Amino acid sequence: AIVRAHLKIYGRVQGVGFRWSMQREARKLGVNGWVRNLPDGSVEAVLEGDEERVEALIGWAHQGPPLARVTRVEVKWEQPKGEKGFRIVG
Amino acid sequence: AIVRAHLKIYGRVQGVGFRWSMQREARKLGVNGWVRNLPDGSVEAVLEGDEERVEALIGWAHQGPPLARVTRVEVKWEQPKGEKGFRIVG
Numbered sequence: 001a002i003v004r005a006h007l008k009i010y011g012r013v014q015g016v017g018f019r020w021s022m023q024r025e026a027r028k029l030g031v032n033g034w035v036r037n038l039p040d041g042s043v044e045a046v047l048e049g050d051e052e053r054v055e056a057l058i059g060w061a062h063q064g065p066p067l068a069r070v071t072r073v074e075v076k077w078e079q080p081k082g083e084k085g086f087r088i089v090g
Numbered sequence: 091a092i093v094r095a096h097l098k099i100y101g102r103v104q105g106v107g108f109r110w111s112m113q114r115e116a117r118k119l120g121v122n123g124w125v126r127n128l129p130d131g132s133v134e135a136v137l138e139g140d141e142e143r144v145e146a147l148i149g150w151a152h153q154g155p156p157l158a159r160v161t162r163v164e165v166k167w168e169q170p171k172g173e174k175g176f177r178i179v180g
């Protein structure tokens with residue numbers, strides 16, 4: 001089924017390539033959406049596509065790139081909005 | 091590469107078949123470890139195996155079975171211990 005996951009990711013997650021690496025992984029998986037930094041130090045993302053591929057990216061987001069140290073992820077499931085491509089937006 | 095993720099999972103996560111569904115998904119994916127209910131209403135799990143399989147299960151854990159509502163997952167990455175099979179402990 002097609003799903004849309006809205007994430008907030010916490011930890012040592014800025015300045016370590018999280019957004020670029022997420023985008024690379026989304027494009028490999030065929031997941032559309034976006035990622036951005038928030039001013040509290042967290043990362044916000046929208047992941048939209050086939051449930052298996054979205055879940056794969058959610059799981060990836062608990063590890064992140066080598067220097068990320070994620071402590072927690074929050075997911076809110078949403079109705080698909082027809083995201084096209086995976087973009088870094090902030 | 092082999093990884094080990096230690097999770098605490100919060101929300102409406104007990105009394106919804108979460109442990110049974112996680113066990114099913116773990117066995118499907120070939121992830122080793124365990125899951126248990128905690129007295130504060132949260133779920134604790136250890137997931138160990140190939141990183142792609144573990145990541146798929148972590149992603150699944152934010153959806154859960156149909157009635158599950160997962161509000162957050164806390165994660166700690168650990169040194170693998172040699173878990174074999176997945177079981178429910180508590």
Ligand SMILES: [Cl-]
Nearest residue numbers: 017018019020
């Ligand atoms: Cl970044």
Ligand SMILES: [Cl-]
Nearest residue numbers: 107108109110
């Ligand atoms: Cl259960």
Ligand SMILES: [K+]
Nearest residue numbers: 063065066068
């Ligand atoms: K990492």
Ligand SMILES: [K+]
Nearest residue numbers: 153155156158
């Ligand atoms: K659910």
